[PDB]
Amino acid sequence: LNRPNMVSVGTIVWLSSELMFFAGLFAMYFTARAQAGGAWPPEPTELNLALAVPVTLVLIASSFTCQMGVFAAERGDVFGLRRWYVITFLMGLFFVLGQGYEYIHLVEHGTTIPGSAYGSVFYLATGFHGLHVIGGLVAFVLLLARTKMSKFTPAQATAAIVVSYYWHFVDIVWIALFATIYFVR
Amino acid sequence: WSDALALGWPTGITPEAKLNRELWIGSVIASFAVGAIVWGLIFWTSAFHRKKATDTELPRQFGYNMPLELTLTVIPFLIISVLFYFTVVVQERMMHKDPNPEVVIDVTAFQWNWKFGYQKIAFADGSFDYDGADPERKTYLNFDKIETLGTSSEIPVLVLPAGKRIEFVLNSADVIHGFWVPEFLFKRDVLPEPKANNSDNVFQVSEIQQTGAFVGRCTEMCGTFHAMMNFEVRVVEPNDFKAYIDQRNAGKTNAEALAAINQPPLAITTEPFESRRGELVPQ
Amino acid sequence: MHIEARLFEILTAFFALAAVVYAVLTAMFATGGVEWAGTTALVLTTGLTLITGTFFRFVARRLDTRPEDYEDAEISDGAGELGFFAPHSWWPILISLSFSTAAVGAALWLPWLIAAGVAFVITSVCGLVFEYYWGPEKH
Amino acid sequence: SSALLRTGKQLFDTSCVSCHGANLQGVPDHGPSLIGVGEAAVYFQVSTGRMPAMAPRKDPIFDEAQIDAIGAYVQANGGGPTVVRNPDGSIATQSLRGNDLGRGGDLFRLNCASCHNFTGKGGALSSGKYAPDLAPANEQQILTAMLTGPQNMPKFSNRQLSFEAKKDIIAYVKVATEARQPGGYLLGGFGPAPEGMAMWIIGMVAAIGLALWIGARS
Ligand SMILES: CC(C)=CCC/C(C)=C/CC/C(C)=C\CC/C(C)=C/CC/C(C)=C/CC/C(C)=C/CC/C(C)=C\CC/C(C)=C\CC/C(C)=C/CC1=C(C)C(=O)c2ccccc2C1=O
Ligand code: HEC
Ligand code: HEC
Ligand SMILES: [Cu+2]
């Protein structure tokens, strides 16, 4: 029975809704850029492309690690699943820490949320994505803990798969945000 | 006879208002026709009651009449296309903005009152080259020399000439307001930063046929006393208008400048009712 | 699953057409140029429909006909054993109470209440996720 | 100067004249008299964003030298308290801070703590209104508020509370709102209500969790 997977359908449609949420955020950002004429990144702001690219590379690497974990999960092997998902969790935590460090260095040199119109849209566009990353990390921890406490079944496999493409959605959203904020300007 | 088919629309004091009223009456007649036909169909089909003589024979169970679907989907396209054509025509004929008006009023809306400016007068007869102030704009609001300011005890009155091209430039100090004079059959929102919000805060009327007093309301949501932002428009002849402008250039209030040309100095259409608190109030 | 994919594909086509038309017609003939809000909204609505329709198409392209996708199917064809459907549970109301606590702490700016609500949300979601997987107690 | 100040008040058709009148005698409908308060009342009411209104603290509209103008205008109509300036032209920041702390704390507990708190937190008053937290308040703002006595707050004249005592109280407040706590996490600055809540939600939860782990259930 169960020719298509039901948790998969649910996760896909919910990911679509979250795409609409990020649509709202992108609209907020794209407006008020057309109002800043000239040096539209204002008085004190300078983005650090020497630190923005490594964290993106780590995020893509984590996506690849998660896909490898999915491959390990499709065959009834739980230990490879665990290894690859621990690696993915660590890479994601490193991304989050790098983003926080960039936040600190950017806030102690000017740009703040109540300081300018650019700081507000920048911080809201990136912080909600960071929150989604933290949610994905929590999901990873819960999935691993659940694998520890019962026999490995196709339901466990399905859980791994749906968590994986949630992570992939987060990664593609970050790619869009990065391309929009650091290159297009 | 057409006073009933206008559903309460006041007869306009402006040619664009007259055109709008014609379009409105035509559309209302069309909608009444369609609604009457549909009501007739429903009330007719409500005579197909179950007859007691009807045996154990259900109705014809037909369903799925295919060409009727195409017919009833092709006619409403016709009606809506005709209405859209005429709507586009009238809405282009309602926002014209010729470059050479005769009077330019600067309307400013703030928290629960109005302020009018008299920016420029330039009559086509050849006369009345008036001007504005701009020594103090130090950033989007407009300041002039002859300004009519309303208060909670006196309602602002905007004196305008009859039969002249008038232009309005709308600006708000804090929040969104609305500029509705019902006799114009037209209204527009008053925005804080109209340029940074890509809005056209400028609109013109060709002439005002009648004379006298007309009311004006706010049509936004502004806060507590949103229902207490009324104003009045007084339309006089260009001679009374030159008399008023001169009596105002000589330092005089709006009420005195109005009493100088034999006009009631206070608003006769609406009255400056107190900022009320209730009926049982301890006054 | 042909009709689901076809529905979402029709929606995607219409949304993409509307998006591109609105984008170019605001690039021209507009008081300030591109509108930049409705354009983004329509583009990402098209993206939503595209994601869902593409997933459904990929699922349908590698699946045998189901008893509910085939007329002349019999009710004895679906005979078998369906999935697992949860009986009674009290974790949803606790999740809702935790989320409401965090929401009240965000409405009235109280960071201690926000943190307590977040911790309660984590705890109750853990309880919901582990409910049918805890083993017997090890004594 | 006083000329742009009159324009500051008069041409502020949105802000000033509708509530108080161009005579500054006070419109009976909207606003009080406003004839005897000096530049101190203006500097407190406007720089804290409480003035021109439609009453929590907000960000001020007028910033650049059009506050001191309106203050000089209000003062020129009728005398009153003035803003304390450093002998350079600016408004005093460090010079307003006193050196005596015990006296400042005694006077704070006697005259001020009854409404706000021991350490400057907020307080609850009757029928709605409250007393605010004193952490976001500036030092000239403390001085001017204590001089003018805003809504429901008593007016502490300079003849009943000397300027030296006011400086000591300012010092005590700025030290009580900026000092680290040598005990751990500050639980809000109130008494044992946060402490009892923390006990119930942290300590007792940890204890009952340890009991659930160690003991058996059946
Ligand atoms: C069981 C019953 C009380 C026996 C009655 C027998 C008979 C009727 C005696 C007559 C007495 C009648 C007439 C008067 C009653 C009042 C009187 C007896 C009070 C004396 C004190 C004493 C008896 C307390 C009663 C028992 C006590 C309240 C137990 C409640 C807690 C138990 C049941 C488990 C709670 C589990 C706990 C770890 C999780 C809850 C976490 C938090 C929300 C607890 C709630 C909570 C509490 C309990 C606080 O005390 C508190 C104090 C300050 C700030 C906040 C809180 C707070 O949030
Ligand atoms: C009608 C709204 C309103 C507006 C707008 C307004 N005032 Fe007020 N003002 C009041 C009221 C009412 C009070 C009394 C304080 C209270 O009720 O809490 C007050 C109090 C004051 C006080 C303190 C009075 C005292 O005795 O210490 C000052 C100073 C003041 N206003 C100045 C101004 C100035 C200057 C402007 C123009 C920039 C202005 N206000 C605009 C209504 C207003
Ligand atoms: C309960 C009566 C009461 C007393 C006594 C009192 N306060 Fe106030 N205080 C208030 C109220 C009410 C306000 C709010 C003023 C307003 O909203 O306009 C206030 C406002 C203030 C502010 C303004 C804070 C801000 O951020 O705007 C300061 C500073 C202040 N008080 C200091 C003091 C000092 C120092 C003392 C002791 C000399 C004191 N207060 C005594 C009730 C009181
Ligand atoms: Cu209004």
JSON list of C-alpha atoms in Angstrom, two decimals, chain B residues 16-131:
[
{"chain": "B", "resi": 16, "resn": "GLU", "atom": "CA", "xyz": [-16.30, 66.02, -15.26]},
{"chain": "B", "resi": 17, "resn": "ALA", "atom": "CA", "xyz": [-18.82, 65.43, -12.47]},
{"chain": "B", "resi": 18, "resn": "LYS", "atom": "CA", "xyz": [-21.67, 65.64, -15.00]},
{"chain": "B", "resi": 19, "resn": "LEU", "atom": "CA", "xyz": [-19.92, 63.10, -17.23]},
{"chain": "B", "resi": 20, "resn": "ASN", "atom": "CA", "xyz": [-19.34, 60.80, -14.26]},
{"chain": "B", "resi": 21, "resn": "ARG", "atom": "CA", "xyz": [-23.03, 61.06, -13.36]},
{"chain": "B", "resi": 22, "resn": "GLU", "atom": "CA", "xyz": [-24.10, 60.12, -16.88]},
{"chain": "B", "resi": 23, "resn": "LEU", "atom": "CA", "xyz": [-21.84, 57.06, -16.79]},
{"chain": "B", "resi": 24, "resn": "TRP", "atom": "CA", "xyz": [-23.18, 56.14, -13.35]},
{"chain": "B", "resi": 25, "resn": "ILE", "atom": "CA", "xyz": [-26.83, 56.35, -14.41]},
{"chain": "B", "resi": 26, "resn": "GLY", "atom": "CA", "xyz": [-26.19, 54.26, -17.51]},
{"chain": "B", "resi": 27, "resn": "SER", "atom": "CA", "xyz": [-24.41, 51.56, -15.52]},
{"chain": "B", "resi": 28, "resn": "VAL", "atom": "CA", "xyz": [-27.16, 51.56, -12.89]},
{"chain": "B", "resi": 29, "resn": "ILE", "atom": "CA", "xyz": [-29.84, 51.06, -15.54]},
{"chain": "B", "resi": 30, "resn": "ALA", "atom": "CA", "xyz": [-27.87, 48.16, -17.04]},
{"chain": "B", "resi": 31, "resn": "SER", "atom": "CA", "xyz": [-27.41, 46.50, -13.64]},
{"chain": "B", "resi": 32, "resn": "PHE", "atom": "CA", "xyz": [-31.10, 46.88, -12.81]},
{"chain": "B", "resi": 33, "resn": "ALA", "atom": "CA", "xyz": [-32.01, 45.25, -16.13]},
{"chain": "B", "resi": 34, "resn": "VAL", "atom": "CA", "xyz": [-29.77, 42.24, -15.49]},
{"chain": "B", "resi": 35, "resn": "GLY", "atom": "CA", "xyz": [-30.94, 41.87, -11.90]},
{"chain": "B", "resi": 36, "resn": "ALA", "atom": "CA", "xyz": [-34.59, 42.07, -12.92]},
{"chain": "B", "resi": 37, "resn": "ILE", "atom": "CA", "xyz": [-34.07, 39.33, -15.51]},
{"chain": "B", "resi": 38, "resn": "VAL", "atom": "CA", "xyz": [-32.36, 37.03, -13.00]},
{"chain": "B", "resi": 39, "resn": "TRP", "atom": "CA", "xyz": [-34.99, 37.68, -10.33]},
{"chain": "B", "resi": 40, "resn": "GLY", "atom": "CA", "xyz": [-37.70, 36.91, -12.88]},
{"chain": "B", "resi": 41, "resn": "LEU", "atom": "CA", "xyz": [-36.02, 33.63, -13.79]},
{"chain": "B", "resi": 42, "resn": "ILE", "atom": "CA", "xyz": [-35.76, 32.58, -10.14]},
{"chain": "B", "resi": 43, "resn": "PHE", "atom": "CA", "xyz": [-39.34, 33.56, -9.32]},
{"chain": "B", "resi": 44, "resn": "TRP", "atom": "CA", "xyz": [-40.57, 31.67, -12.40]},
{"chain": "B", "resi": 45, "resn": "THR", "atom": "CA", "xyz": [-38.64, 28.51, -11.50]},
{"chain": "B", "resi": 46, "resn": "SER", "atom": "CA", "xyz": [-40.25, 28.81, -8.06]},
{"chain": "B", "resi": 47, "resn": "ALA", "atom": "CA", "xyz": [-43.53, 27.83, -9.75]},
{"chain": "B", "resi": 48, "resn": "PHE", "atom": "CA", "xyz": [-42.27, 24.30, -10.55]},
{"chain": "B", "resi": 49, "resn": "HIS", "atom": "CA", "xyz": [-43.59, 22.97, -7.25]},
{"chain": "B", "resi": 50, "resn": "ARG", "atom": "CA", "xyz": [-43.89, 19.24, -6.68]},
{"chain": "B", "resi": 51, "resn": "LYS", "atom": "CA", "xyz": [-47.40, 18.42, -7.86]},
{"chain": "B", "resi": 52, "resn": "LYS", "atom": "CA", "xyz": [-49.44, 15.89, -5.90]},
{"chain": "B", "resi": 53, "resn": "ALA", "atom": "CA", "xyz": [-50.39, 14.28, -9.22]},
{"chain": "B", "resi": 54, "resn": "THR", "atom": "CA", "xyz": [-46.70, 13.68, -10.03]},
{"chain": "B", "resi": 55, "resn": "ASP", "atom": "CA", "xyz": [-46.35, 9.89, -9.87]},
{"chain": "B", "resi": 56, "resn": "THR", "atom": "CA", "xyz": [-43.23, 7.90, -9.01]},
{"chain": "B", "resi": 57, "resn": "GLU", "atom": "CA", "xyz": [-41.49, 9.57, -11.96]},
{"chain": "B", "resi": 58, "resn": "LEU", "atom": "CA", "xyz": [-38.57, 11.85, -11.19]},
{"chain": "B", "resi": 59, "resn": "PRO", "atom": "CA", "xyz": [-37.90, 14.74, -13.61]},
{"chain": "B", "resi": 60, "resn": "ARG", "atom": "CA", "xyz": [-36.04, 14.45, -16.91]},
{"chain": "B", "resi": 61, "resn": "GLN", "atom": "CA", "xyz": [-32.60, 14.44, -15.19]},
{"chain": "B", "resi": 62, "resn": "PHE", "atom": "CA", "xyz": [-31.07, 16.15, -18.19]},
{"chain": "B", "resi": 63, "resn": "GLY", "atom": "CA", "xyz": [-28.02, 18.23, -17.26]},
{"chain": "B", "resi": 64, "resn": "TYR", "atom": "CA", "xyz": [-25.19, 19.24, -19.63]},
{"chain": "B", "resi": 65, "resn": "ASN", "atom": "CA", "xyz": [-26.66, 21.64, -22.19]},
{"chain": "B", "resi": 66, "resn": "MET", "atom": "CA", "xyz": [-23.47, 22.54, -24.05]},
{"chain": "B", "resi": 67, "resn": "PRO", "atom": "CA", "xyz": [-24.17, 25.41, -26.51]},
{"chain": "B", "resi": 68, "resn": "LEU", "atom": "CA", "xyz": [-26.09, 27.37, -23.87]},
{"chain": "B", "resi": 69, "resn": "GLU", "atom": "CA", "xyz": [-22.85, 27.39, -21.88]},
{"chain": "B", "resi": 70, "resn": "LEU", "atom": "CA", "xyz": [-21.00, 29.06, -24.76]},
{"chain": "B", "resi": 71, "resn": "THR", "atom": "CA", "xyz": [-23.80, 31.59, -25.27]},
{"chain": "B", "resi": 72, "resn": "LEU", "atom": "CA", "xyz": [-24.05, 32.59, -21.61]},
{"chain": "B", "resi": 73, "resn": "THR", "atom": "CA", "xyz": [-20.27, 32.78, -21.35]},
{"chain": "B", "resi": 74, "resn": "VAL", "atom": "CA", "xyz": [-19.92, 34.90, -24.50]},
{"chain": "B", "resi": 75, "resn": "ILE", "atom": "CA", "xyz": [-22.53, 37.58, -23.74]},
{"chain": "B", "resi": 76, "resn": "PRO", "atom": "CA", "xyz": [-21.13, 38.82, -20.37]},
{"chain": "B", "resi": 77, "resn": "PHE", "atom": "CA", "xyz": [-17.78, 39.30, -22.09]},
{"chain": "B", "resi": 78, "resn": "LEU", "atom": "CA", "xyz": [-19.61, 41.68, -24.44]},
{"chain": "B", "resi": 79, "resn": "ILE", "atom": "CA", "xyz": [-21.22, 43.69, -21.64]},
{"chain": "B", "resi": 80, "resn": "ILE", "atom": "CA", "xyz": [-18.03, 43.96, -19.59]},
{"chain": "B", "resi": 81, "resn": "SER", "atom": "CA", "xyz": [-15.96, 44.94, -22.64]},
{"chain": "B", "resi": 82, "resn": "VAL", "atom": "CA", "xyz": [-18.38, 47.76, -23.51]},
{"chain": "B", "resi": 83, "resn": "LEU", "atom": "CA", "xyz": [-18.39, 48.97, -19.90]},
{"chain": "B", "resi": 84, "resn": "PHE", "atom": "CA", "xyz": [-14.59, 48.80, -19.76]},
{"chain": "B", "resi": 85, "resn": "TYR", "atom": "CA", "xyz": [-14.23, 50.86, -22.94]},
{"chain": "B", "resi": 86, "resn": "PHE", "atom": "CA", "xyz": [-16.50, 53.62, -21.66]},
{"chain": "B", "resi": 87, "resn": "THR", "atom": "CA", "xyz": [-14.89, 53.49, -18.20]},
{"chain": "B", "resi": 88, "resn": "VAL", "atom": "CA", "xyz": [-11.44, 54.01, -19.71]},
{"chain": "B", "resi": 89, "resn": "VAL", "atom": "CA", "xyz": [-12.74, 56.91, -21.80]},
{"chain": "B", "resi": 90, "resn": "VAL", "atom": "CA", "xyz": [-14.32, 58.65, -18.81]},
{"chain": "B", "resi": 91, "resn": "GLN", "atom": "CA", "xyz": [-11.34, 58.05, -16.52]},
{"chain": "B", "resi": 92, "resn": "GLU", "atom": "CA", "xyz": [-8.97, 59.58, -19.05]},
{"chain": "B", "resi": 93, "resn": "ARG", "atom": "CA", "xyz": [-11.38, 62.51, -19.49]},
{"chain": "B", "resi": 94, "resn": "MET", "atom": "CA", "xyz": [-11.32, 63.03, -15.69]},
{"chain": "B", "resi": 95, "resn": "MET", "atom": "CA", "xyz": [-7.55, 63.44, -15.09]},
{"chain": "B", "resi": 96, "resn": "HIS", "atom": "CA", "xyz": [-6.34, 65.91, -17.73]},
{"chain": "B", "resi": 97, "resn": "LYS", "atom": "CA", "xyz": [-4.06, 68.46, -15.99]},
{"chain": "B", "resi": 98, "resn": "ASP", "atom": "CA", "xyz": [-3.54, 71.14, -18.60]},
{"chain": "B", "resi": 99, "resn": "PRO", "atom": "CA", "xyz": [-0.26, 72.98, -17.89]},
{"chain": "B", "resi": 100, "resn": "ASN", "atom": "CA", "xyz": [-1.84, 76.45, -17.46]},
{"chain": "B", "resi": 101, "resn": "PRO", "atom": "CA", "xyz": [-4.44, 76.60, -14.68]},
{"chain": "B", "resi": 102, "resn": "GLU", "atom": "CA", "xyz": [-5.81, 79.82, -13.22]},
{"chain": "B", "resi": 103, "resn": "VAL", "atom": "CA", "xyz": [-5.76, 79.16, -9.46]},
{"chain": "B", "resi": 104, "resn": "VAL", "atom": "CA", "xyz": [-3.47, 76.81, -7.51]},
{"chain": "B", "resi": 105, "resn": "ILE", "atom": "CA", "xyz": [-4.51, 75.75, -3.99]},
{"chain": "B", "resi": 106, "resn": "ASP", "atom": "CA", "xyz": [-2.14, 73.98, -1.59]},
{"chain": "B", "resi": 107, "resn": "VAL", "atom": "CA", "xyz": [-4.15, 71.69, 0.68]},
{"chain": "B", "resi": 108, "resn": "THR", "atom": "CA", "xyz": [-2.49, 70.50, 3.88]},
{"chain": "B", "resi": 109, "resn": "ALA", "atom": "CA", "xyz": [-4.13, 67.92, 6.12]},
{"chain": "B", "resi": 110, "resn": "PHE", "atom": "CA", "xyz": [-2.94, 67.31, 9.66]},
{"chain": "B", "resi": 111, "resn": "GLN", "atom": "CA", "xyz": [-4.32, 65.74, 12.82]},
{"chain": "B", "resi": 112, "resn": "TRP", "atom": "CA", "xyz": [-7.97, 66.73, 12.64]},
{"chain": "B", "resi": 113, "resn": "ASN", "atom": "CA", "xyz": [-7.85, 70.00, 10.69]},
{"chain": "B", "resi": 114, "resn": "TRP", "atom": "CA", "xyz": [-7.03, 71.47, 7.27]},
{"chain": "B", "resi": 115, "resn": "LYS", "atom": "CA", "xyz": [-5.02, 74.39, 5.92]},
{"chain": "B", "resi": 116, "resn": "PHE", "atom": "CA", "xyz": [-5.32, 76.11, 2.54]},
{"chain": "B", "resi": 117, "resn": "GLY", "atom": "CA", "xyz": [-2.63, 78.11, 0.82]},
{"chain": "B", "resi": 118, "resn": "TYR", "atom": "CA", "xyz": [-3.52, 80.14, -2.32]},
{"chain": "B", "resi": 119, "resn": "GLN", "atom": "CA", "xyz": [-0.21, 79.38, -4.01]},
{"chain": "B", "resi": 120, "resn": "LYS", "atom": "CA", "xyz": [-0.72, 81.14, -7.35]},
{"chain": "B", "resi": 121, "resn": "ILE", "atom": "CA", "xyz": [-3.38, 83.12, -9.19]},
{"chain": "B", "resi": 122, "resn": "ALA", "atom": "CA", "xyz": [-3.08, 83.79, -12.93]},
{"chain": "B", "resi": 123, "resn": "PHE", "atom": "CA", "xyz": [-6.24, 84.74, -14.85]},
{"chain": "B", "resi": 124, "resn": "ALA", "atom": "CA", "xyz": [-6.41, 84.19, -18.60]},
{"chain": "B", "resi": 125, "resn": "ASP", "atom": "CA", "xyz": [-8.18, 87.54, -19.13]},
{"chain": "B", "resi": 126, "resn": "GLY", "atom": "CA", "xyz": [-4.82, 89.06, -18.22]},
{"chain": "B", "resi": 127, "resn": "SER", "atom": "CA", "xyz": [-4.76, 90.03, -14.54]},
{"chain": "B", "resi": 128, "resn": "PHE", "atom": "CA", "xyz": [-3.98, 88.61, -11.12]},
{"chain": "B", "resi": 129, "resn": "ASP", "atom": "CA", "xyz": [-0.33, 87.56, -11.18]},
{"chain": "B", "resi": 130, "resn": "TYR", "atom": "CA", "xyz": [-0.05, 86.40, -7.58]},
{"chain": "B", "resi": 131, "resn": "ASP", "atom": "CA", "xyz": [2.72, 84.32, -6.04]}
]
